[model samples]
Target chain A: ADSELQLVEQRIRSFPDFPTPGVVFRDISPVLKDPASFRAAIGLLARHLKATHGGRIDYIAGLDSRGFLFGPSLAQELGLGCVLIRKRGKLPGPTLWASYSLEYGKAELEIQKDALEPGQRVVVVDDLLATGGTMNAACELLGRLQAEVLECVSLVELTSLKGREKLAPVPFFSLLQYE
Target chain B: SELQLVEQRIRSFPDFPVVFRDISPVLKDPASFRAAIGLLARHLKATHGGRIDYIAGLDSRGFLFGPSLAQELGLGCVLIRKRGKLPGPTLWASYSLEYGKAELEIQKDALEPGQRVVVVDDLLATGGTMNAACELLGRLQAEVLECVSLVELTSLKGREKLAPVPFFSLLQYE
Candidate 1:
């Protein structure tokens, strides 16, 4: 079991000072590029959820762009549908919006108002969890719609960043963690 | 298998020159979503089979299907993202939009020369984005086996623009 997690971690490439100075970006492109590694990552995540949440999850809400990568596959694995949480204006129709602080400025995320029903359970997925800003904002949006956020998950987590602190009571999980 | 179930789930919105077909409804239903992937996988396996090396997904929507499809086929997936999104050495292609031009890029090391790739997207309209994606792959010297989409707007004649590069779609819109 632990070896599977390591297999996923081995495929992740680290780049120093990426997109900004003093930041090391964990790129999962390598993992996505390998079928076994990609399957392992999703399988591990699905296994964890099945053990914890069992059949209680209603949807897997993937954040725009990166989250879209794993969200659908993970949802399908668990026999659940996947909903989208996108950047403002990307999703059509009536949407509920939430804004969160970014390192540079504030950015907004939106979800179609009717995407979920009141009291439905959701597990948010993304590629990486850094500051937890976007994931928290996603939970905030789900809260507005009265959907229960089962948890927030990512393939990787920067433990030193302490993103989980920002998630507060919602809970967070990642297959691989780096300081 | 027929795509009537997949086709019926598509939502259309009136837009300039043509209507936009949204596949979100299909993604939201586990049964339909699995069926869609199964169909795409079946087609690729029957057609390309062992010839494919990678699955290149267009930015945004293509990202939705590419990874899942790659997973289904047991192949690696690569991203063709909007400019400024991918970090590191990159190759790019620009195409004209109604307004200014937009650029799509791929990481320089994403694919090796002579690798075989199949590009994917949610919709093929005007063929601007997919064409640009093919161009980027070509520049990297990766042979594009084909370009696939969940839906295609045939009335726009987008397939013609993809000339030389074969294209396929699960559902068509006139």
Candidate 2:
């Protein structure tokens, strides 16, 4: 939440059609470029979260793709568990699966059948919560696996997507909300 | 109880021919989680014992088991991540993500190249993710002595692929 604006405006470089054509991807490369800022951002995230469930949290499930970067380290601080809610077929066997519609296409998340102990308290984490689609789908995936959705956390949220409103029942946490 | 504990955290579903293994359960009951790690560590200790320098954990799940296991065994922790997940520059071995294969990165200069390393994950599926991790470690010149997890699906033949490298999972499913 703190310095995100400063970091994005001053630090991050925005490029249009980064991995493809016509898709304007806001590259967090510059923000990640500076070691101090990167650590600061993660520290801020960890601090904000540690205040609440540092002790209660069992596992921090980083939704694949970007969540991987900060998820592992944060799990370390809590001396807790961390797992990847990866895309389809990424994990080996007996996965619980859920599919969600994105603004453009669809994506899936899975947890292996025995990856968690029954009733494990888990938080589904990601880089950002946008359209509520991805985050919500991840929640479903975790649910199918039986892990408690302690909360959904992100570095940023696209307010235009009204993502939070749809993430009912399950708490939504964002470091920064953006349009 | 420990194995069941991990099982409870899993979200198993039907329909897909291939299953996704997530090792998030151990996080809930740290004691149960810790026990599994301890079991694996002892397995290694009894065998490979004292030759390894650090434990290499796959990002996310591996992190869950790697650091603590390393700490218990007096070793350090290194990580492997999905392509481009690491900040700054990295060395990676490409592997499949959800759909397409992406690069799995390990810090280029972290662990000493050719050093003996132990690898950990939550579970082994087709051994896809771990295989890539091994490749990355090899590229870095680290000798991966074993792959450890809480459980492994024997049907997938993951252990076969990781042969010669002791695959130590606390539990295995037929």
Candidate 3:
């Protein structure tokens, strides 16, 4: 009941032509404003992620921009390592890179290659699961570093686009799903 | 009323671009500070009919009031941060950056859906961040009837951006 209430309260609002025109933006700040609600939301996410991919993940890779939000705290909770997957200029050391497309532009995400051991297992954290592009590229980066990507965990998943399918080889978690 | 005292307790420093600062002079004095907080508690009791919901604050300054205010309000607090400050799985909110155009993220689990929240800030500048809070809250579908501030800078026209939600400024200055 709490989970369902949180899912209902944290409705992903679409702002047509946001950030850039012709782009329907999905916003999630509303969910971050409530204390009990926020705890409930992430608590459920942690439980689910741990249950589904618990043993396999050596670390949780948080995607820059949003993944950084819960990456470390959640990692501490799980007693796992936390790695940052960031944009080109941000990473401090030798990194593995992956390129992708946005609705209006093209970009890349990187993970420090040395952050993990060979065959290390990880899950990526982000805000929304819309296009599979950035996440797919992240998975590719994980492969380049010889780490195993256990899952793609997010607060939201857009099912109509079938984004999850693109990142098929790994398991996924998007607490609230929508068209 | 405490509102008048709160207004008197804060001082104004203008001309920063977005909004001026309502420098809380009371914080400089231990007795006045706690007295103001006492006023805040009494105000909440009188207005919200007792024990509202959670405490929400913007980063930096918002971060200051969050846990403390929540403690006063009998709720917990969550920190909404700028990009990359936090690590791991998080929900992202892309907005026109303040200080000029940037990004922010909360753990996807920061606030559960339908939880009640009261956004607190030292001052209301442009309401850019608050509006973002509103948009985000709207998505989360929480009951957001109150937006409280220690001070309100009326000149920036930030109020125009904050639609539907009623704002309660403990003080208005600068």
Candidate 4:
């Protein structure tokens, strides 16, 4: 809400019609391109998690690819293990899988069966929230493991998409919102 | 001490007698994981003079510790993901795979012309992947300050191929 957060938001580069037509892509590559801004973004989230959850989290389950960006680092800052919830077939070993529908296609997500113990608390992190399909599937997959998904967090939230609505029952927190 | 714990976790498989190092066990224990990244950070700190522009890591495994290490150094991170994985315009490089060849790419704007980068990955096998990554970073006019990996297959002599760019690994297996 302050200029520092604005500093984090401004670094996110936007390009019209990327990976599709009539859709503006908010690329965080620019944000990740600067050290200070990146740290600021991660620090804000870490502080929020600590203030709200204290030391209750056992793991940070990051969605593959983009979630990989902040999840591990945040987990490290919080002194917790980070589990990867990858796309279908991406994770080896025994995995619990969940299928979901994207805006344009159907996709599946999987978590390594042994990644966590039942009843562990988890915070799911991703780069952005679009349709919430990915986050929803991640929570469901974690549910199969009987892990408590404390909250879902993202650096940017596309409120227009109402991805947050899809993630009912589990609280959602994000540092930046683009309406 | 940390490096030895890492060495102990790596196991060998019967097929092709290939050695695989799993950082999961290292990460599973917070101290060991922190030490792993700490070693890489110390190495860079001793050499790079604190001018690292970005920490560019390969797709998948590289994504694991790369961002964490980058955050440790207070620098931004860039990803060298697989071909077609990164959206928007990208520059790509093809490296020889055992069966055929594979391609990797970086977004054109990932780095500035003179941005200095330190590439990190979980393992260094034949070095082809890191080598190709080096070439791609070079083509983009960014300076690859150094290449760091948690484990190295010294018998493969992967470092030899990555000449002129300094390379460092915590554990080496010949």
Candidate 4 per-residue lDDT, tens place, A67-123, comes to 887877888888987778888875545689988986545789988788888998999
Tell me the tens digit of each residue's lDDT in model 2 across A19-125: 44653445443334344444555566677678867578778877765576556556655676677677876666667888887544687877667666668898777
Best by TM-score: 1
- Give one digit per residue, the lDDT tens place, for model 2 in B31-136: 5565675677778899886898777777665655665576567665666776644544578776663324556887676566678988888778678788888988
> In candidate 3, what are the lDDT values of residues A127-167, reduced to their tens digit?
67787787888888888888877788888787877888888
Q: Which candidate has the top score in DockQ?
A: 1
Ranking by DockQ: 1, 4, 2, 3
Q: Interface-residue RMSD per candidate?
A: 1.9, 6.9, 12.1, 2.8
DockQ winner, 1 or 3: 1
Top candidate by lDDT? 1
Candidate 3's C-alpha runs over 4 A off are A1-11, B1-174
lDDT of 1 at B111: 90
| Per-model DockQ against the true two-chain complex | 0.71, 0.12, 0.07, 0.53
Worst 10 residues of 3 chain A by lDDT: A68-77
**Which digits, one per residue and each the tens of the lDDT, describe model 1 over residues A131-161?**
8899999999999999999899999999887
Model 4 clash pairs are A35-B76
| lDDT of residue A55 for candidate 3 | 59
TM-score of chain A of each: 0.96, 0.86, 0.89, 0.96
